[PDB]
Short mmCIF file of C-alpha atoms in Angstrom, two decimals:
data_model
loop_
_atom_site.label_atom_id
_atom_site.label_comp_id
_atom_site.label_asym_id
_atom_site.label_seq_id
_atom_site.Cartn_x
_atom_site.Cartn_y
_atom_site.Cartn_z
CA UNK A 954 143.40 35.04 -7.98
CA UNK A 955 139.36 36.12 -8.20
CA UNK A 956 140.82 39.09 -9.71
CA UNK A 957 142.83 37.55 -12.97
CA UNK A 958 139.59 34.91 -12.62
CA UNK A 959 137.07 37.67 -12.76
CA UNK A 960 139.76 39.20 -15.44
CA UNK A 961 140.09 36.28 -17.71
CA UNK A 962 136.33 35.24 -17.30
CA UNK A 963 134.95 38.59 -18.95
CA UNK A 964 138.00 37.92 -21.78
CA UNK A 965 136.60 34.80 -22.95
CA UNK A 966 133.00 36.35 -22.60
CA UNK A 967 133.89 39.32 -25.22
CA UNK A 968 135.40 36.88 -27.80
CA UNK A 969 132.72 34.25 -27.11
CA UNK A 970 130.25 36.96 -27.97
CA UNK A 971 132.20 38.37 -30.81
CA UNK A 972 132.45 34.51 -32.49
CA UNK A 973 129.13 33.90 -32.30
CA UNK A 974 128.22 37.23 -33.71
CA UNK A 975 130.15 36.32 -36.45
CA UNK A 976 128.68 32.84 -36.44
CA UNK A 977 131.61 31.67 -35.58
CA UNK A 978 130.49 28.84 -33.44
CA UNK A 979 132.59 26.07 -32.40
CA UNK A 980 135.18 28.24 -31.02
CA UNK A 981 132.08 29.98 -29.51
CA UNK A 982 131.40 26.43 -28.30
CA UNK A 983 135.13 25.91 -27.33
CA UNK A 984 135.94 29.71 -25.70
CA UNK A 985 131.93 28.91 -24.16
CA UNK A 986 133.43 25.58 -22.14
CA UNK A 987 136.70 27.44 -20.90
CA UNK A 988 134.10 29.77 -19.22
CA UNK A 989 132.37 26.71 -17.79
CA UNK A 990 135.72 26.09 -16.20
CA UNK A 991 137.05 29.52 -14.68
CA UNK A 992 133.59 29.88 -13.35
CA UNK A 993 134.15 27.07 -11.16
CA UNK A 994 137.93 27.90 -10.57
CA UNK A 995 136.76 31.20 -9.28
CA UNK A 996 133.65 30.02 -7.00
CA UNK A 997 136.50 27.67 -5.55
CA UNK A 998 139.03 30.02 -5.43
CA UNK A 999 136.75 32.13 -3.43
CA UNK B 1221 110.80 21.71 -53.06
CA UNK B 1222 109.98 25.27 -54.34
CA UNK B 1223 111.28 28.49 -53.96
CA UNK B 1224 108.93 29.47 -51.44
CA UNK B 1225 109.19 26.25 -49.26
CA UNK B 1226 112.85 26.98 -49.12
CA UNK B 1227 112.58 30.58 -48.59
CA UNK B 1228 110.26 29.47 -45.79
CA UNK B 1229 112.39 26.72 -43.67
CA UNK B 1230 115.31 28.78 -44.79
CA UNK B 1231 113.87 31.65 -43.12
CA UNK B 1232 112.85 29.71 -40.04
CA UNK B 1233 116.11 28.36 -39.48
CA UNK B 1234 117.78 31.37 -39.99
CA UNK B 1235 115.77 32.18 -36.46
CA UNK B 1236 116.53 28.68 -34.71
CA UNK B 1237 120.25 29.07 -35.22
CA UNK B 1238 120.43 32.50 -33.89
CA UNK B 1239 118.10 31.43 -30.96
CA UNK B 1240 120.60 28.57 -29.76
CA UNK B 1241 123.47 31.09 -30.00
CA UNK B 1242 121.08 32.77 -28.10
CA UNK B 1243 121.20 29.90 -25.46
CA UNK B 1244 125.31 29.12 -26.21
CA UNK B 1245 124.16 26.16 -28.09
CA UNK B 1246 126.59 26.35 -30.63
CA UNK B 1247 127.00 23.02 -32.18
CA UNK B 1248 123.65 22.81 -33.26
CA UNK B 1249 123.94 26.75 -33.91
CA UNK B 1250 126.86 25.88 -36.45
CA UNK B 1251 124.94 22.51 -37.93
CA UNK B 1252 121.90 24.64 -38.30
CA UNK B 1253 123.90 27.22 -40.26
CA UNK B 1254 125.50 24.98 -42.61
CA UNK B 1255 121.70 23.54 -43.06
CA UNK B 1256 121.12 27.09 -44.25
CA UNK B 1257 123.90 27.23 -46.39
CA UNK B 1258 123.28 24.30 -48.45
CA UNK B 1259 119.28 25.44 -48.65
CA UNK B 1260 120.10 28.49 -49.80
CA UNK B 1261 121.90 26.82 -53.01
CA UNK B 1262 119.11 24.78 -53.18
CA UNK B 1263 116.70 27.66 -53.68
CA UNK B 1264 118.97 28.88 -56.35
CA UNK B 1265 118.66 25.96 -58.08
CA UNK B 1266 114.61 25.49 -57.39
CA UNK B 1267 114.30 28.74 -59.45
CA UNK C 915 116.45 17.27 -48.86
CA UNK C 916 119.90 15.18 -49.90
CA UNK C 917 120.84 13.33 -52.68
CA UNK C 918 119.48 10.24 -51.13
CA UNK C 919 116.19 11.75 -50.58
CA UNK C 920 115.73 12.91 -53.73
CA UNK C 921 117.16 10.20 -55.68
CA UNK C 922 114.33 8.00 -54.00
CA UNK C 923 111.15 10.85 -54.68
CA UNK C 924 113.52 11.25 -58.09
CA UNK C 925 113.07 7.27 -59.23
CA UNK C 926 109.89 7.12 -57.48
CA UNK C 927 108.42 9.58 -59.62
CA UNK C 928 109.65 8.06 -62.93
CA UNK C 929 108.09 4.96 -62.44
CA UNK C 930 104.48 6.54 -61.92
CA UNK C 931 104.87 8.87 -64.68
CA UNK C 932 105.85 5.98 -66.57
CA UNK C 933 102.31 4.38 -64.87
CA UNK C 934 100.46 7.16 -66.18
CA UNK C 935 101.71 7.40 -69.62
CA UNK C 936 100.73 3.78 -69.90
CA UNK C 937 96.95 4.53 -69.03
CA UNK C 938 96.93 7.13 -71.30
CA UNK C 939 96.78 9.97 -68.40
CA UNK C 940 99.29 12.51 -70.41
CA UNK C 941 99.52 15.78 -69.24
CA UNK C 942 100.06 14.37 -65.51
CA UNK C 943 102.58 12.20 -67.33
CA UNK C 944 104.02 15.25 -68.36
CA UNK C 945 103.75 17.08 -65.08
CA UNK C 946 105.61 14.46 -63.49
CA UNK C 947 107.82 14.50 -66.48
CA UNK C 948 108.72 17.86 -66.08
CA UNK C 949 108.81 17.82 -61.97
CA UNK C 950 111.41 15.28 -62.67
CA UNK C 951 113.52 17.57 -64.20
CA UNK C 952 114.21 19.82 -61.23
CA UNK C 953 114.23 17.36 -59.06
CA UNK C 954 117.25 16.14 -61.10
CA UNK C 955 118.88 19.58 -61.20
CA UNK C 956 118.06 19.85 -57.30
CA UNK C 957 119.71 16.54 -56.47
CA UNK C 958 123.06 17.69 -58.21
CA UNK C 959 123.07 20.58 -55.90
CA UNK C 960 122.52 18.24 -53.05
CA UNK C 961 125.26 17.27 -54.14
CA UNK D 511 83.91 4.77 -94.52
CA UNK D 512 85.21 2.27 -91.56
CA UNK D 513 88.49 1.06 -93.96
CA UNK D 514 89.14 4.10 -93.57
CA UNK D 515 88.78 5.06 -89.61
CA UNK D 516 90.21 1.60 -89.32
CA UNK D 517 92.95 3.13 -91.38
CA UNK D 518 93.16 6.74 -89.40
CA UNK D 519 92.45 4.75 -86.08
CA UNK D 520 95.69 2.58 -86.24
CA UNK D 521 97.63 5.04 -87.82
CA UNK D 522 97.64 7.64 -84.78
CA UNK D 523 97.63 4.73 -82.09
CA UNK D 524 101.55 4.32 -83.57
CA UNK D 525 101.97 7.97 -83.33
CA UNK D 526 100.31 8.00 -79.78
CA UNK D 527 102.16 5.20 -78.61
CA UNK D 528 105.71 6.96 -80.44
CA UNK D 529 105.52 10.06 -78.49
CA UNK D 530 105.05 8.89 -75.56
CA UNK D 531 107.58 6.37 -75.91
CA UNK D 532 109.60 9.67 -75.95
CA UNK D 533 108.07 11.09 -73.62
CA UNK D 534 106.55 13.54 -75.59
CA UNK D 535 103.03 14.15 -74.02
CA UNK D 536 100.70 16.96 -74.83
CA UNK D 537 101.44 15.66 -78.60
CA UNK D 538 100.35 11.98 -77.05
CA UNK D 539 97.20 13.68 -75.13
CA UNK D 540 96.27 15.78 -78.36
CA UNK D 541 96.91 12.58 -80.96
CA UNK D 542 94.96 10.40 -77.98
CA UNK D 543 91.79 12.25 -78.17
CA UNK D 544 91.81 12.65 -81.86
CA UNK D 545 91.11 8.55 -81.67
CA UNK D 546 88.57 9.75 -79.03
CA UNK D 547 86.17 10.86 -81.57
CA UNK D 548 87.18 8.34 -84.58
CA UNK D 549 86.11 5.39 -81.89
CA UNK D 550 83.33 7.29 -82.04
CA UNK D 551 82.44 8.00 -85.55
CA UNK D 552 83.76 4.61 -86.29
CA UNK D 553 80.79 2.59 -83.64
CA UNK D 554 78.53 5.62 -85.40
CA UNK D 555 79.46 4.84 -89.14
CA UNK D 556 79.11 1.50 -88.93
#
């Protein structure tokens, strides 16, 4: 549902950040295309 | 090759790779911060 | 700045120090000499 | 007399040439204008 969506989509968002803060990339890069899917998921699943 | 041309594009990059993170450009974020890393030894070694 | 970079400045520079020395033009000669021997150093970090 | 910068002329042009066969400049510069003046005096006493 838009709610897990909207739930899972601010997950990924807080680790993304917390990688890259870390400079962690790649999983920053890896977490950062998940969110390039659930986006979508969600504006269809709307 | 001297310690102040590396402290220099070490320095810039240091700003580059935090400005693609900025943008979610890893990758590029993570190639420029190995860059860094090797530069810095370098630098070490220029002294 | 790799190994291959500075391996070619690195046995560039040893011929014209060389080129010097043989015109008599010491001091560059040893300037050269001496930038040589970071640039070695450097290269093994490169490494 | 000029046997003798003849002699003195030579004899540093091996050292010159030694040194900086070993790479031993300065040494090579100082020797090299020491046969500067010799050249010199040589041409002069002659």
């Amino acid at each position: 549902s838009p709610k897990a969506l909207q739930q899972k989509i601010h997950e990924l968002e807080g680790l993304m950040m917390q990688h890259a803060q870390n400079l962690e990339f790649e999983e920053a890069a890896q977490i950062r295309d998940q969110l390039h899917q659930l986006r979508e998921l969600f504006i269809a699943a709307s």
